[PDB]
Amino acid sequence: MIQRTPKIQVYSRHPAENGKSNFLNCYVSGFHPSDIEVDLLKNGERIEKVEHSDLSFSKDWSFYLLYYTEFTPTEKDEYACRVNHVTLSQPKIVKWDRDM
Template sequence: MKALISFALFCVICVTVQGKVSSPKVQVYTHFPGEYGKPNTLICHVSAFHPPDINIDLLKDGKVIPDAQQTDLAFEKGWQFHLTKSVSFTPQKGEAYTCKVRHMDKDNSYQWEPNM
């Protein structure tokens, strides 16, 4: 409970300090060059956003991929924030992988473009 109150206070201070909304910049990529049928890590890096009201989902063919890991919320100079979410996966031809980002009740989807 104490951590929740501290985070809420932190968010109020952030909104007061910055006072404006910055839309997130999103990059979707893999740890290794993409190869169908070979294990890899799908990564969605979201940066330069404010306030920190954000949700990130990694999707395969429109469905949430289970067991994705997310970094802790961190901030950059100017009180803009960044997060990274990743998951192990093995890409297959014909499958679509997407990073869905909800920031301030606005949804955007970013598809991974395999260079294969």
């Protein structure tokens, strides 16, 4: 077999501004096999109600998946996406960089 590591992007639907409602996205793509765990974290704690899209793949057969949840950004609150995959010795935790 040949395995492919997920490419991880954590980002808000719209440019984030404190107090204004938004959506938190974690988009994993280009990975294989398809079985994968993705969680959103608020200040280190797992957010309980997180939705995701239906499994789909690109032309090169590599899978992609979107995880998301409604949220209201604050100056203090920190967010991150924890991706668990067989190609990762330990779960990859990517922090949300709101102004990149």
